[PDB]
Amino acid sequence: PDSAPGQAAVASAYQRFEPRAYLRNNYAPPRGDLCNPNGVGPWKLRCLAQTFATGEVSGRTLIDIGSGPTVYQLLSACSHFEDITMTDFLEVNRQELGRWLQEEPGAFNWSMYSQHACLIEGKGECWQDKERQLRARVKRVLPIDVHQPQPLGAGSPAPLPADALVSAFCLEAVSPDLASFQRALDHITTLLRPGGHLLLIGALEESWYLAGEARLTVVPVSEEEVREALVRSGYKVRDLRTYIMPAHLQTGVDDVKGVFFAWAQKVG
Amino acid sequence: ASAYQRFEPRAYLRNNYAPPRGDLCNPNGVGPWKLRCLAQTFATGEVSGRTLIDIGSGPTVYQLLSACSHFEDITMTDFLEVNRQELGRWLQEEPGAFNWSMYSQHACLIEGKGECWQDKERQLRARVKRVLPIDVHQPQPLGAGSPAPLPADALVSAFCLEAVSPDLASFQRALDHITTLLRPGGHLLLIGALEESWYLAGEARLTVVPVSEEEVREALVRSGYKVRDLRTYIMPAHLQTGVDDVKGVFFAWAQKV
Ligand SMILES: Nc1ncnc2c1ncn2[C@@H]1O[C@H](CSCC[C@H](N)C(=O)O)[C@@H](O)[C@H]1O
Ligand SMILES: Nc1ncnc2c1ncn2[C@@H]1O[C@H](CSCC[C@H](N)C(=O)O)[C@@H](O)[C@H]1O
Ligand SMILES: Oc1ccnc2ccccc12
Ligand SMILES: Oc1ccnc2ccccc12
DSSP states (O other), X not given: OOOHHHHHHHHHHHTTOOHHHHHHHHHSTTTTOTTOTTSHHHHXXXXXXXXXXXXXXXXXXXXXXXXXXXXXXXXXGGGSOSEEEEEESOHHHHHHHHHHHTTOTTSOOOHHHHHHXXXXXXXXXXXXXHHHHHHHHEEEEEEOOTTSSSTTOTTOSSOSSEEEEEEESOGGGGOSSHHHXXXXXXXXXXXXXXXXXXXXXXXXXXXXXXXXXXXXXXXXXXXXXXXXXXXXXXXXXXXXXXXXXXXXXOOSSBOOOEEEEEEEEEOO | OOGGGSBOHHHHHHHHHSTTTTOTTOTTSHHHXXXXXXXXXXXXXXXXXXXXXXXXXXXXXXXXXXGGGSOSEEEEEESOHHHHHHHHHHHTTOTTOOOOHHHHHHHHHHHTSOOOHHHHHHHHHHHEEEEEEOOTTSSSTTOSSOOSOXXXXXXXXXXXXXXXXXXXXXXXXXXXXXXXXXXXXXXXEEEEEESOOEEEEBTEEEEOOOOOHHHHXXXXXXXTEEEEEEEEEEOOGGGOOSSBOOOEEEEEEEEEO
């Protein structure tokens, strides 16, 4: 009933979120080992690539929900949208992205992800070009809070409503419980036009993960709880797949048991 | 022949394998075309065996990227010690080795097998058993007591013969010399400059014999090869850069018969 408390714990916890530690924990090897086809990184990129390869997900505007300090989730997307908004709750994540946008050396190096996306897209694109295009297409980086009824605030810059949403490992990671998760899904759904698509990636049955000193709390969800929430929010589920976390990728940075990928289309 | 003594490996690599010629992002460039020829050829599944020799390797490895997954024993060769050492440096992942990663990436890209570039380089480094001295002007280019397993199931050679031959007949002899290294039925992939007369390698100014596509064809036939394929890349203006005067690049797939 009372949402403020939980949301408050969440905002408090994320004050210690350390972008570099999170980058190290989830995007450096072994999880970041793009050479193993059976690994989670490759599975994620594959889900994204194949979905965009249908030609079915297009438009002018895309919004990435809770980008954090990562851009891989946009590698396959960025050829299908002119205008891309990135977003995060934390300024420090926003600056990280700033560093990559400016093509700075101190920036996290995504080039293995870029190359791998080029490889699986099968268009013989070099990664430098992929990166140049993503950089061109990211039109803004915005503060966001998915617990607000207007997640971007009122009279935001973002071209609304968007043609498509992307969101990876955000909702479940900032929702104390399932009902909060559902509301979070409801709030971002206001930003999507009817007939628009949502690509949702996330952890299955996770209760915690580490990002430096910060040990943050996650609502454990199942594939079925994810399908229901999507239906509940007004989506047709077009695709929902499950990756089971291999013991060797279960590194102690979290208690994640699997990863889900959902392609959902909002009812018009 | 004495000219090759001033040949600077890094200058040669700069002149030919760094941008603009080495910008792999442009599909119409010489780099991608070369890599395309190599990959398409091996993808046929018709060039295979246990052992392969790369003739006149210089300080470059890109010419074995697509090849290395069809041959378990690979021999690399060159006339200069400095080149052999430059190879050593990349094979052993020693410091200051040349960075071939862009090319590895692009072969993986072109090959379309979903292979990561690190796996590709790993396999290459593993299958290159030895780096050997060679002089194609010699009837036995490898010498007498070579560790190289003979005869080779296949040969590769890029930009060597024309660049070490004062004239057509020398070129022809050189081809004959390397052909004795190839098993009958075996395959040869020959890449090189068309209508080139000189190129620079730092302090070295090397003389080149200018050959035509049809001259290259006849040479292969005269050496007893059947020409399965011969393609020309015409040199765009923006890749004509003062380091030489080549007009085009040829690619030849020949079979000893
Ligand atoms: N109340 C809130 N509303 C929207 N995003 C939030 C939020 N609280 C935290 N976040 C952001 O949610 C992210 C979870 S980590 C996911 C990072 C990135 N999307 C990737 O795929 O790895 C963090 O970047 C965090 O700052
Ligand atoms: N007499 C000779 N016999 C065999 N190779 C020779 C030679 N004289 C010079 N070479 C080698 O021929 C090479 C020409 S350039 C290097 C070509 C390299 N394979 C690549 O594809 O770019 C030089 O490395 C040179 O050292
Ligand atoms: O790819 C990921 C990003 C963030 N968290 C993750 C947790 C488990 C497995 C993969 C993850
Ligand atoms: O790829 C090359 C290697 C050596 N010489 C070259 C001359 C012109 C164009 C390409 C070349």
